Amino acid sequence: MTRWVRGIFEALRPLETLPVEGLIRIWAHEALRLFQDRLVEDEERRWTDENIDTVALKHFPNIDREKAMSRPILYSNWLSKDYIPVDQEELRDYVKARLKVFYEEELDVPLVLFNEVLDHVLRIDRIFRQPQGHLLLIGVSGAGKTTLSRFVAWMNGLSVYQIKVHRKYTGEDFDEDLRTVLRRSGCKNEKIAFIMDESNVLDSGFLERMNTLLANGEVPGLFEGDEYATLMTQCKEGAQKEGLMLDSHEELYKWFTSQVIRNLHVVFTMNPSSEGLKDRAATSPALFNRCVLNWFGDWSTEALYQVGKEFTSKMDLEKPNYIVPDYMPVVYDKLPQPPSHREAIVNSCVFVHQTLHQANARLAKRGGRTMAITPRHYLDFINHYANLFHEKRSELEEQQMHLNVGLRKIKETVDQVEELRRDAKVNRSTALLKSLSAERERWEKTSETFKNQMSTIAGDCLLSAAFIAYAGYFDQQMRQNLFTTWSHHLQQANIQFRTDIARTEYLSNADERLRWQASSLPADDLCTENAIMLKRFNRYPLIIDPSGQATEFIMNEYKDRKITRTSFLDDAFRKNLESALRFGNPLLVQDVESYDPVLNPVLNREVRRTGGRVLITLGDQDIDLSPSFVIFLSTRDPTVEFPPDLCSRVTFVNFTVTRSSLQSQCLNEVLKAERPDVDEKRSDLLKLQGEFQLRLRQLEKSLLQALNEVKGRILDDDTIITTLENLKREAAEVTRKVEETDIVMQEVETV
Amino acid sequence: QDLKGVWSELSKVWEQIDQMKEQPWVSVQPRKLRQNLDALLNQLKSFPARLRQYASYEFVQRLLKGYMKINMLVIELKSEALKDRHWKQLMKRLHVNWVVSELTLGQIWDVDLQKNEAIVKDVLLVAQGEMALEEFLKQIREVWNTYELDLVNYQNKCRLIRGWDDLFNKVKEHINSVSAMKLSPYYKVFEEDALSWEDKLNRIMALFDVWIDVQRRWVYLEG
Numbered sequence: 015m016t017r018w019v020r021g022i023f024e025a026l027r028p029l030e031t032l033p034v035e036g037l038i039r040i041w042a043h044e045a046l047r048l049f050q051d052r053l054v055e056d057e058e059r060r061w062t063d064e065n066i067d068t069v070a071l072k073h074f075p076n077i078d079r080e081k082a083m084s085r086p087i088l089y090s091n092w093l094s095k096d097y098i099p100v101d102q103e104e105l106r107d108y109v110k111a112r113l114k115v116f117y118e119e120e121l122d123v124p125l126v127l128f129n130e131v132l133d134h135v136l137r138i139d140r141i142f143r144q145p146q147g148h149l150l151l152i153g154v155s156g157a158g159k160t161t162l163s164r165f166v167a168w169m170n171g172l173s174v175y176q177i178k179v180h181r182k183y184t185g186e187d188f189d190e191d192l193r194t195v196l197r198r199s200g201c202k203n204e205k206i207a208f209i210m211d212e213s214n215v216l217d218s219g220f221l222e223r224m225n226t227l228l229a230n231g232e233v234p235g236l237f238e239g240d241e242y243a244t245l246m247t248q249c250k251e252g253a254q255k256e257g258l259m260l261d262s263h264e265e266l267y268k269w270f271t272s273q274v275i276r277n278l279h280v281v282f283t284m285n286p287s288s289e290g291l292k293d294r295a296a297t298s299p300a301l302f303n304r305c306v307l308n309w310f311g312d313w314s315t316e317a318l319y320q321v322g323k324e325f326t327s328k329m330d331l332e333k334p335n336y337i338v339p340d341y342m343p344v345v346y347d348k349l350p351q352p353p354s355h356r357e358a359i360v361n362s363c364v365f366v367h368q369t370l371h372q373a374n375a376r377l378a379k380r381g382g383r384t385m386a387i388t389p390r391h392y393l394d395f396i397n398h399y400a401n402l403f404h405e406k407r408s409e410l411e412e413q414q415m416h417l418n419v420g421l422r423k424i425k426e427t428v429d430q431v432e433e434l435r436r437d438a439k440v441n442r443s444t445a446l447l448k449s450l451s452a453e454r455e456r457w458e459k460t461s462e463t464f465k466n467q468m469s470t471i472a473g474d475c476l477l478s479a480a481f482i483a484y485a486g487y488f489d490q491q492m493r494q495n496l497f498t499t500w501s502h503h504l505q506q507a508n509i510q511f512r513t514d515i516a517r518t519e520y521l522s523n524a525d526e527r528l529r530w531q532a533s534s535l536p537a538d539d540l541c542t543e544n545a546i547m548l549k550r551f552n553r554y555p556l557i558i559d560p561s562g563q564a565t566e567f568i569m570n571e572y573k574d575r576k577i578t579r580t581s582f583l584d585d586a587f588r589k590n591l592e593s594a595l596r597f598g599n600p601l602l603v604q605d606v607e608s609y610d611p612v613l614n615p616v617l618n619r620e621v622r623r624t625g626g627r628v629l630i631t632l633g634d635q636d637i638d639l640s641p642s643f644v645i646f647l648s649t650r651d652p653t654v655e656f657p658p659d660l661c662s663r664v665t666f667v668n669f670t671v672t673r674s675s676l677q678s679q680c681l682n683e684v685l686k687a688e689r690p691d692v693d694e695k696r697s698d699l700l701k702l703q704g705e706f707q708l709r710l711r712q713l714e715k716s717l718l719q720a721l722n723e724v725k726g727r728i729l730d731d732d733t734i735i736t737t738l739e740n741l742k743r744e745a746a747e748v749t750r751k752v753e754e755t756d757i758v759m760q761e762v763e764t765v
Numbered sequence: 766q767d768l769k770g771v772w773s774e775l776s777k778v779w780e781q782i783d784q785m786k787e788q789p790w791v792s793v794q795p796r797k798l799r800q801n802l803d804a805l806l807n808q809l810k811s812f813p814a815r816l817r818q819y820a821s822y823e824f825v826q827r828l829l830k831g832y833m834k835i836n837m838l839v840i841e842l843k844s845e846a847l848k849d850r851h852w853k854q855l856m857k858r859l860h861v862n863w864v865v866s867e868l869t870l871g872q873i874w875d876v877d878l879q880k881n882e883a884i885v886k887d888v889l890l891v892a893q894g895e896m897a898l899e900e901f902l903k904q905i906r907e908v909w910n911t912y913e914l915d916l917v918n919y920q921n922k923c924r925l926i927r928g929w930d931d932l933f934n935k936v937k938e939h940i941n942s943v944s945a946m947k948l949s950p951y952y953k954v955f956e957e958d959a960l961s962w963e964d965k966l967n968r969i970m971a972l973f974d975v976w977i978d979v980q981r982r983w984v985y986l987e988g
């Protein structure tokens with residue numbers, strides 16, 4: 015209530031003329047910032063929202079509730095001055111401009127400004143623009159806590175200072191860091207927005223000092239001995255700068271303390287955890303007394319949809335022949351009707367994220383082990399989608415260009431043979447023409463197949479990327495269930511894709527699989543999918559396996575790149591990581607349960623790119639990050655839990671066997687060892703998804719290489735036609751496989 | 766006429782700007798420079814709109830606006846950062862031949878700082894890492910040259926040493942930091958001195974590792 019009255023008084027001080035509706039507006043805005051801000055779930059927020067208006071209308075009749083309480087209530091002083099309320103769209107434009115500028119100075123990584131972020135920016139700005147305005151942010155990892163804190167601090171001129179935590183981080187190091195930040199904030203009169211995560215808070219020794227600093231404004235005992243003498247020496251100069259000449263030591267220390275309160279805002283970024291939050295209350299009450307707390311958890315459907323639209327702007331996703339389906343599976347209520355192809359794709363992506371939330375909640379209800387799902391997973395998914403789409407479209411386009419070059423060469427060769435005919439041999443020439451014509455119509459059919467593939471590529475890539483980024487911790491049955499759910503959702507949206515897509519072959523080639531099998535990797539569907547995830551990832555993969563087969567697999571795979579093994583328990587770890595940054599060799603990590611927070615800059619991919627240099631801030635030291643660096647985190651206990659911070663920075667790769675992996679392995683073993691014909695036909699069907707076409711493409715490249723030498727010598731018997739009839743027979747074989755795919759698939763299903 | 770009047774005002778403004786630019790870079794105070802530039806801008810804005818519509822006035826106004834924009838780069842350049850080697854790198858990359866003693870704000874302002882913002886920022890960050898490393902070294906020098914052993918009476922028999930924990934912790938921290946200093950691209954400067962101090966740290970570490978055990982044994986056997 016006191017903060018309420020103080021806030022209303024502050025918003026009323028610069029104004030001189032204000033109607034009653036404006037006063038009710040300020041009252042409602044302050045109520046929402048004080049009471050609705052701290053709420054956790056949706057129902058309480060709606061309850062508070064409706065009851066503020068109810069109380070306002072009950073206590074103040076005869077007022078216009080529209081202007082008095084409009085739905086987008088929002089106050090800021092950036093536009094004009096005097097804390098005058100601002101419309102949402104003009105504020106959005108201003109924040110976009112300032113965000114582009116921020117992009118130019120620091121943190122070029124794109125940010126998307128949806129309504130939630132637009133509100134949190136003003137809340138953080140209001141808290142910063144206040145003496146002793148300490149702030150606590152509670153939200154799921156990757157919701158944009160640190161990023162918005164840094165953005166607002168930069169916009170207000172606050173310099174962000176965050177300590178670097180690691181293992182064996184003794185209290186003396188934190189004492190030195192506190193001394194440095196206090197000296198910078200008070201002695202030099204430079205404002206600091208002090209930001210901490212929960213990695214460095216887990217230790218209870220630091221919480222006493224932080225509590226004292228939050229409450230008293232200065233922590234006694236941090237400055238003593240010669241350190242206190244240097245503090246006083248610089249404090250005298252600071253007083254000289256402000257023209258506040260003082261000589262007594264205790265008065266100078268009081269001035270330093272006041273400078274600290276005026277110019278130090280501490281931001282505590284924490285993940286949502288009821289038991290941990292209660293423990294923090296038990297060990298430090300000021301975190302809920304001095305620190306005003308702000309909650310924003312998972313992004314709403316609007317936020318996910320807007321992020322998807324913005325991050326899929328480079329992508330084509332434009333089908334002029336996209337027929338709208340009646341009864342669209344819709345997860346965004348504001349989806350345009352009728353939606354375009356890009357709108358449908360982004361809606362499907364949001365559905366993928368929400369159905370993964372549903373699957374995780376259902377698995378938690380079942381009693382199994384769940385991993386927290388964060389918007390960073392959505393960003394990783396959309397990045398995989400963009401990369402896969404670009405790669406697959408590039409491959410299809412280059413194959414089409416190769417086919418066009420081949421067709422032009424064939425036309426030139428046919429014209430040359432016609433000119434030669436213009437001059438037993440004539441029958442051979444006629445047979446050559448017939449074969450060339452037939453293979454030409456075959457390549458026209460190949461062009462038609464390429465057009466079909468370009469039609470299906472968007473859906474195929476979407477499903478593949480969703481599998482890569484999202485799945486990985488669940489067993490084989492849950493992976494297949496998620497894939498079937500996504501496929502059915504897309505089929506309801508008329509997003510064209512292959513009905514029998516094969517994940518392993520759409521995401522790899524024959525040579526890659528043979529290389530994997532050369533190393534220690536069993537020919538298991540779960541193992542092949544895990545190898546796929548270990549190949550294509552953006553966040554560094556965290557491998558869990560009770561047998562340790564994956565560790566040996568990635569050791570053999572990266573042996574040529576002098577991969578090194580190092581555990582977190584070993585004290586040399588840091589040093590080894592240093593070498594991994596200097597040289598660029600991969601570095602496998604074991605024993606992830608005892609996580610070292612020093613890895614956070616590596617996992618967060620905090621790269622500073624300046625002056626032809628790429629730097630990583632390992633603790634307090636900047637290191638040149640080698641371009642070909644990669645780190646794998648490994649463990650051996652499936653029954654382990656991970657913090658949401660770690661869970662949101664890595665892609666999980668589960669090697670554990672369950673009732674569905676072992677079932678598939680045993681069924682495949684029986685099929686191979688008792689029905690070799692059925693296993694052969696199954697492999698024929700499963701490799702038909704490009705591998706036969708790849709062999710045809712390679713042999714056609716060889717044929718073009720042979721045919722390029724066409725002058726007389728190619729007519730040794732007027733028939734080099736043996737190579738082209740070889741091509742014709744493999745083409746007829748794969749064609750017959752294509753027409754008879756349903757019968758073979760049904761027979762394999764029956765067996 | 767009005768054209769003659771605006772030409773005269775332009776000549777006066779140009780004379781003021783040239784007189785301000787005659788100040789050598791050493792004695793150019795960024796705060797006073799910004800205040801004087803703001804005063805000149807206010808003087809320019811005091812002209813009538815008819816005189817303001819002239820192209821030359823617009824050119825000089827936008828030049829002063831660019832100078833105000835690059836005043837931040839001027840502040841960053843005029844510090845303990847550039848020294849003379851970073852200035853040498855800037856001269857080499859910008860292909861300009863100035864004199865350090867004769868350096869003036871006019872020479873730097875002639876070169877487009879706004880166009881060369883990336884180059885200037887890279888040089889500034891290199892200098893940032895450089896004084897970071899240099900001040901870390903100087904801290905090592907001042908903490909080790911002024912450090913004294915904690916001698917204590919021992920039963921009026923002799924003077925022994927305490928403080929093994931603090932001294933060993935300091936040695937370990939310093940040796941770890943010096944060893945890690947071999948990383949980073951900034952390591953290429955002042956390498957030999959860093960190796961010399963590494964050798965000194967190793968020598969003291971070994972000597973006092975032996976010394977603590979010798980002291981313990983001698984106390985025990987004396988008892």
Ligand SMILES: Nc1ncnc2c1ncn2[C@@H]1O[C@H](COP(=O)(O)OP(=O)(O)O)[C@@H](O)[C@H]1O
Pocket residue numbers: 123124125126127128131154155156157158159160161211283321390393659
């Ligand atoms: N509004 C947004 N639009 C797009 N990307 C965002 C937005 N907010 C956050 N992100 C991305 O999500 C990540 C946020 O991580 P962060 O919230 O800093 O983690 P933590 O809260 O654990 O510090 C950033 O890498 C950023 O790129």
